[PDB]
Amino acid sequence: MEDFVRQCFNPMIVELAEKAMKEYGEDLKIETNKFAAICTHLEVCFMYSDFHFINERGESIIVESGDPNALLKHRFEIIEGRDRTMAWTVVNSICNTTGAEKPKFLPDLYDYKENRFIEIGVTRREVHIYYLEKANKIKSEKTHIHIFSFTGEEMATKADYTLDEESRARIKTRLFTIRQEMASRGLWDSFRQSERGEETIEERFEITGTMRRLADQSLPPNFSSLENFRAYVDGFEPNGYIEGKLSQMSKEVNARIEPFLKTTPRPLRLPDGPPCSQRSKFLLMDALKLSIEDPSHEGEGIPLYDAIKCMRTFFGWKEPNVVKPHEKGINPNYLLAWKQVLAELQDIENEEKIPKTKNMKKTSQLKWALGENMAPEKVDFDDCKDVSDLKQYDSDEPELRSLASWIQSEFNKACELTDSSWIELDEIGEDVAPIEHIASMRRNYFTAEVSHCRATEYIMKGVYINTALLNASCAAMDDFQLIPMISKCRTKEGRRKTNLYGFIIKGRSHLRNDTDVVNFVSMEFSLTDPRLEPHKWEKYCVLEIGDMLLRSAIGQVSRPMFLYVRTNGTSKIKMKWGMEMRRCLLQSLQQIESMIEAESSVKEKDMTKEFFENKSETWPIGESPKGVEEGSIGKVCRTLLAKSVFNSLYASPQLEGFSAESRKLLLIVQALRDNLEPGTFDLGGLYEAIEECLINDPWVLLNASWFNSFLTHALR
């Protein structure tokens, strides 16, 4: 039958009908009479629509061939011959522009004169039944319907026929051409009734070929095919198989509970080796401040001018000389770098306006100090294979180092009060609710407690230094840059003040990965002689740069004044995390506020004021040789703030591992102290897990010592 559509109809219509065939997903080889019927429907749609044009009037202009002009409007514009999505697109667009009603089924054409749709259907059966059939299929329709049938008859409601009658003679001539051409073909044994509305399909997902063999190799050891295994599974029913293997399984497979008593836990062993060194990016306990007493705010001002003005406030400069060498570098380079920094600072002082940011010369001194041109050149393996020295990067456990007493004193003095306010908080919306007033009062109390704390000063120092370093690295990637360490505080009298700890020289910072390292050299003034705790300054070079006179009742001290100079490095991640050190304030004060709220849930009243003023209640916050010492809530605030600050400063994988594996043991010990009969399956394994995190970090070793002390004081 398909030979007929090969022969007669034009290409355009046959591929339109083929795409309509693909539309609903049925195959053309099984039933083709539908293809012919609907392609004839589509053909009558065209032949009825084309050759029919309109101009600004009604009364369509009919031309056998559209002449070249702007007057190519089509009388009837076709609906079908398009995908369902576009057919409904045209339906909705016509409804929204023509203000007509939206039909629920697919029309075939639209006309302007009568501003409505045409649903053309030419069926094998006579018209006077198919018409009202499709009419009762369509609900309350104003779209006019018109149908032909092979006998040659026409019909329509309203007795309406919308265009010329010679066109309809055309239609029925086409119709009988179709008819008495099948006459030569002979199809009416099924042509009248060949489609009955079949819609059914079964989804087929068959495993075959290579993928089947893979299925045959992904079974238990004693199975040969997926078919057999699935049959076995379907036939499988529970018949007490877990019990049999449990009985047969060796009894050494057990989870015996070892009781956890007061005498069970042993102190954590600390590693032994050379004392632990300093790792901070700046001096914390041995910092010195040169000040100007200016009225500018933290960010307000220009760095270089402030630094120069602060440094001019000090008199007593001496020619620098080596006091304590780096022990691994070239100290003369550090000396020359310091003198170069001074010289270029003067050079800025001379000229017209202090630059906002200064670049330094790339001398051999800072070329060595900043580690320039030291990365091995990257080459290909095929060119370097016979080199005996060629091997992997050194990948082994870090060097072992024992704890020293300097970190303990540094933390002790990091929780001490100061003679300045190191936090100038921002603005918030004016409090409107009583709860907001309570929150503001609490916040004011904590700010009064923690602002005068060395932890806040360290927070500001780190934030400013890391912000400046990151910005300089991102801006001046190539050229070495000078950045004075600046921090602005407010005195007890209320006068604002600036403080200059020293200088940082940032080097080449072409940082691609988050782990890539930018090297800088840090110089900081101090008065602490490095000849008393040399092991804490393994990586520092310390010079003697001047003498300071601070008013004291013992005449006047006239102390020496040294310069701690070192080469340090950071990374994008480290800079970003060090510039978010202000969340240590959060951590600490959230803990304290949780304490206050928990206690106030007992007594139905806010308990902040008496906690902060009466200072009757105290918490164990340290141990003295006499015994455990307790301090007021403010001291707890400062201690927790210092702990968070040191966590942010000495952060490392060792800290995370020890924290987790020691929190586990802390929970076990707490369960013991709560009389909850705690038990363990392998306590030695937990101990070994904790002890492997303690390698060389001073902070984690101090935490381990604190944990041992807590165990000793606990378990009683």
């Epitope: 164990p620 015994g627 455990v628 010492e629 307790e630 004081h713």
Partner: nanobody
């Protein structure tokens, strides 16, 4: 932790008394007309120089050695770690 205080009683003014508590530790007191008062853990102003706190970690005992007692020391003296029931001191 359970706590039992011993060593209270009736005493002369200017007399001496050794409190002991069988079990950081300390001593607080409660006069009939008031709430808790800190004695020792560090000593309060009202009792400093007169009174001494000590402990024997091998005996599990904290001691309060009271000397040159005043009528104003008359209170129930409570030990703590957890609170004892208190021992009556009357001067």
């Amino acid at each position: 932790v359970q706590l039992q205080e011993s060593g209270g009683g009736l005493v002369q003014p200017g007399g001496s008394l050794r409190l002991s508590c069988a079990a950081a530790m300390g001593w607080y007191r409660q006069v009939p007309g008031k709430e808790r008062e800190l004695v020792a853990t560090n000593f309060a102003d009202s009792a400093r120089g007169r009174f001494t706190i000590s402990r024997g970690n091998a005996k599990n005992t904290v001691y309060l050695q009271m000397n040159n007692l005043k009528p104003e020391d008359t209170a129930v003296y409570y030990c703590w770690s957890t609170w004892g029931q208190g021992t009556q001191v009357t001067v």
